Structure formats: structure tokens, C-alpha cells
Amino acid sequence: AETVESCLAKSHTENSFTNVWKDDKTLDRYANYEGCLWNATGVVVCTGDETQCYGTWVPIGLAIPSGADINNYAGQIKSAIESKFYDASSYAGKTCTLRIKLAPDGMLLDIKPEGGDPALCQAALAAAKLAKIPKPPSQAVYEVFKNAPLDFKPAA
């Protein structure tokens, strides 16, 4: 078994988890993996149903009591948008949740804030509008992300 203190020492990981749940207050997204509790940070890209999310995952203590093509394209959307958020640490401590509109093209049709800090939400919109999102690898994967939820939760 892990201790709370061994968990907090694990390395951050870039990946997606399934069985994700949200805190509709903090707007935090969490997951249990290998006996630790993880929180999704940076830019976070979820499937339309918000069960599977790709983010920069950070451990915050002990756990609380297609397939590869989906995980891969979510990673590509995250990198395309987060690489344009040049001054993320200026919003450390803030969150914004947004929703996108994607074309089969990979073109960003639209993006809209849905909640969180107003100055971070405006910076997130500007970063997303600069992004060059690759084309989806398949119509099936496009349908999965064509209306995806996106969070920004920047680090210190």
C-alpha cells in the first residue's frame, strides 16, 4: 500500500483516465489510480460525456474509497490549445470551464465559456482561437469530440 505522503511524491503524468468525477463547486475533476487520488490540471479535454478526461494529472493524497484513438486525439487537442496559452502562471489559483465546437476538418467552429474566473476565461478563448488543431483521425472520433468540454486550470 501507499501512504498519503508517498502519493504526494509521485510524478505528474500526461494522459487520460476513465471514471472521472467532478466537483461542481470548485470545478475540480478527479480520479483514483493505483491507490492515489489525482486532480486534472493545465488544459483538460474530456469526451462529450465527461467520463474520460485527458489532462496534466497531479496527485493529491490517498485514493477515496477507438479507445487509443480517443485518448490520442484528446491529447492532440490539449497540446494544440495549451501551447498557445503562453502566460498561464498569471492565472494560478483560477479555473475556467468551456465548451468547444469542432468541424470534421479540425477547424475550431466556436468556443464558449461556461463558468469560472472571467479574466482566465478570456485568456483561454484567445489561446484556443490561435490553436492549430489537427484533423480528427476518423468520423467516429470526430463525433466524440465535436462538442467537447474543455477546462483551463493553470499551475503556479
CSV table of C-alpha atoms in Angstrom, one decimal:
chain,number,residue,atom,x,y,z
A,1,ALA,CA,0.0,0.0,0.0
A,2,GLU,CA,0.7,3.7,-0.4
A,3,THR,CA,0.9,6.3,2.3
A,4,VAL,CA,-0.6,9.8,1.7
A,5,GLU,CA,3.0,11.0,1.7
A,6,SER,CA,4.1,8.5,-1.0
A,7,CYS,CA,1.2,9.6,-3.2
A,8,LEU,CA,2.1,13.2,-3.0
A,9,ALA,CA,5.6,12.4,-4.2
A,10,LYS,CA,4.5,10.7,-7.4
A,11,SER,CA,5.5,12.4,-10.7
A,12,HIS,CA,2.8,14.3,-12.7
A,13,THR,CA,1.5,12.4,-15.7
A,14,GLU,CA,0.0,13.5,-19.0
A,15,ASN,CA,-2.7,11.0,-20.0
A,16,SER,CA,-6.4,10.4,-19.8
A,17,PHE,CA,-8.3,8.5,-17.1
A,18,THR,CA,-11.8,6.9,-17.2
A,19,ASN,CA,-14.2,7.0,-14.2
A,20,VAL,CA,-13.5,10.7,-13.7
A,21,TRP,CA,-15.8,12.7,-11.4
A,22,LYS,CA,-16.3,16.4,-10.9
A,23,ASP,CA,-16.8,18.8,-8.0
A,24,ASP,CA,-19.5,21.1,-9.4
A,25,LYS,CA,-18.4,23.8,-6.9
A,26,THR,CA,-14.6,24.0,-7.3
A,27,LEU,CA,-14.9,22.8,-10.9
A,28,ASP,CA,-12.2,20.3,-10.0
A,29,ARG,CA,-12.0,16.9,-11.8
A,30,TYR,CA,-10.7,13.8,-10.0
A,31,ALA,CA,-9.7,10.2,-10.4
A,32,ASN,CA,-8.4,7.3,-8.4
A,33,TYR,CA,-5.4,5.4,-9.9
A,34,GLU,CA,-3.1,2.9,-8.2
A,35,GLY,CA,-4.1,3.9,-4.7
A,36,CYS,CA,-3.7,7.6,-5.1
A,37,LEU,CA,-6.1,10.5,-5.8
A,38,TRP,CA,-5.3,12.6,-8.9
A,39,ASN,CA,-6.6,16.1,-9.9
A,40,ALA,CA,-6.6,17.2,-13.6
A,41,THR,CA,-4.6,20.4,-14.3
A,42,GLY,CA,-3.4,22.6,-17.1
A,43,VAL,CA,-5.6,22.3,-20.1
A,44,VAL,CA,-8.1,19.4,-19.7
A,45,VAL,CA,-10.0,17.8,-22.6
A,46,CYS,CA,-13.0,15.5,-21.9
A,47,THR,CA,-15.3,13.3,-24.1
A,48,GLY,CA,-18.8,14.7,-24.5
A,49,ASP,CA,-20.0,12.6,-21.6
A,50,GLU,CA,-17.2,13.8,-19.3
A,51,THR,CA,-16.3,10.3,-18.1
A,52,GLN,CA,-12.9,10.2,-19.8
A,53,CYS,CA,-10.6,13.2,-19.5
A,54,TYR,CA,-7.1,14.0,-20.8
A,55,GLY,CA,-5.1,16.4,-18.6
A,56,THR,CA,-1.9,17.1,-16.7
A,57,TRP,CA,-2.6,14.9,-13.7
A,58,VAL,CA,-1.3,15.7,-10.2
A,59,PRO,CA,-1.5,13.5,-7.1
A,60,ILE,CA,-3.2,15.0,-4.1
A,61,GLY,CA,-3.3,12.2,-1.5
A,62,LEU,CA,-4.6,8.6,-1.0
A,63,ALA,CA,-7.5,7.4,-3.2
A,64,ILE,CA,-11.0,7.8,-2.0
A,65,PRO,CA,-13.0,4.6,-1.2
A,66,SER,CA,-11.1,4.0,-30.7
A,67,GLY,CA,-10.0,3.6,-27.1
A,68,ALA,CA,-6.5,4.5,-28.0
A,69,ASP,CA,-7.6,6.8,-30.9
A,70,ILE,CA,-9.9,8.7,-28.5
A,71,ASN,CA,-7.1,9.1,-25.9
A,72,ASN,CA,-4.7,10.1,-28.6
A,73,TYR,CA,-6.9,12.8,-30.2
A,74,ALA,CA,-7.8,14.3,-26.8
A,75,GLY,CA,-4.0,14.7,-26.2
A,76,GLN,CA,-3.6,16.4,-29.6
A,77,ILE,CA,-6.4,18.9,-28.8
A,78,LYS,CA,-4.8,19.6,-25.4
A,79,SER,CA,-1.3,20.3,-26.8
A,80,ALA,CA,-2.6,22.4,-29.7
A,81,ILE,CA,-4.5,24.7,-27.4
A,82,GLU,CA,-2.2,24.7,-24.3
A,83,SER,CA,0.8,25.5,-26.4
A,84,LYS,CA,-0.8,28.9,-27.2
A,85,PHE,CA,-1.5,29.8,-23.5
A,86,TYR,CA,1.8,31.5,-23.1
A,87,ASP,CA,1.2,33.2,-19.7
A,88,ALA,CA,-0.7,30.5,-17.8
A,89,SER,CA,1.0,31.2,-14.4
A,90,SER,CA,-0.6,34.6,-14.3
A,91,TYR,CA,-3.9,32.9,-13.5
A,92,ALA,CA,-2.6,30.4,-10.9
A,93,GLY,CA,-5.3,29.6,-8.4
A,94,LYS,CA,-8.1,30.2,-11.1
A,95,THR,CA,-10.3,27.8,-13.2
A,96,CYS,CA,-12.4,28.3,-16.3
A,97,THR,CA,-14.6,25.6,-18.0
A,98,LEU,CA,-15.5,26.0,-21.6
A,99,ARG,CA,-17.3,24.0,-24.4
A,100,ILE,CA,-15.9,23.8,-28.0
A,101,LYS,CA,-17.5,23.3,-31.4
A,102,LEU,CA,-15.2,21.2,-33.8
A,103,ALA,CA,-15.5,20.6,-37.6
A,104,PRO,CA,-14.6,17.3,-39.2
A,105,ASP,CA,-11.8,19.5,-40.6
A,106,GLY,CA,-10.3,20.0,-37.1
A,107,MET,CA,-11.3,23.6,-37.6
A,108,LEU,CA,-12.5,25.4,-34.4
A,109,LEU,CA,-16.0,26.4,-35.2
A,110,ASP,CA,-16.7,28.0,-31.9
A,111,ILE,CA,-15.7,28.1,-28.2
A,112,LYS,CA,-17.8,29.3,-25.3
A,113,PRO,CA,-17.1,29.9,-21.6
A,114,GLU,CA,-19.5,28.0,-19.3
A,115,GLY,CA,-18.1,29.2,-15.9
A,116,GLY,CA,-15.1,30.3,-13.7
A,117,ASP,CA,-12.8,33.3,-13.5
A,118,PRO,CA,-13.6,35.9,-16.2
A,119,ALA,CA,-10.0,37.0,-16.9
A,120,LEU,CA,-8.9,33.4,-17.2
A,121,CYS,CA,-11.9,32.6,-19.4
A,122,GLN,CA,-10.9,35.5,-21.8
A,123,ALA,CA,-7.3,34.3,-22.0
A,124,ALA,CA,-8.4,30.8,-22.7
A,125,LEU,CA,-10.6,32.0,-25.6
A,126,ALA,CA,-7.7,33.9,-27.1
A,127,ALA,CA,-5.4,30.8,-26.8
A,128,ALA,CA,-8.0,28.5,-28.3
A,129,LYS,CA,-8.5,30.8,-31.3
A,130,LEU,CA,-4.8,30.7,-32.1
A,131,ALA,CA,-4.6,26.9,-32.0
A,132,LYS,CA,-4.0,24.7,-34.9
A,133,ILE,CA,-6.0,21.5,-34.0
A,134,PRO,CA,-5.1,18.5,-36.2
A,135,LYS,CA,-7.8,16.8,-38.2
A,136,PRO,CA,-9.6,14.0,-36.4
A,137,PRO,CA,-8.4,10.6,-37.4
A,138,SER,CA,-11.9,9.2,-38.0
A,139,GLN,CA,-15.5,10.4,-38.3
A,140,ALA,CA,-16.1,8.2,-35.2
A,141,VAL,CA,-13.6,10.2,-33.2
A,142,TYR,CA,-14.8,13.5,-34.5
A,143,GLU,CA,-18.3,12.7,-33.2
A,144,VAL,CA,-16.8,12.0,-29.8
A,145,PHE,CA,-15.2,15.5,-29.5
A,146,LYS,CA,-17.2,17.6,-31.9
A,147,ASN,CA,-18.9,19.3,-28.8
A,148,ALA,CA,-16.3,18.6,-26.1
A,149,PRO,CA,-15.9,20.2,-22.7
A,150,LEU,CA,-12.5,21.9,-22.1
A,151,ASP,CA,-11.2,23.2,-18.8
A,152,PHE,CA,-8.3,25.5,-18.0
A,153,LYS,CA,-6.7,25.1,-14.6
A,154,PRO,CA,-3.2,26.6,-14.6
A,155,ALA,CA,-0.3,25.9,-12.3
A,156,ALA,CA,1.7,28.3,-10.2
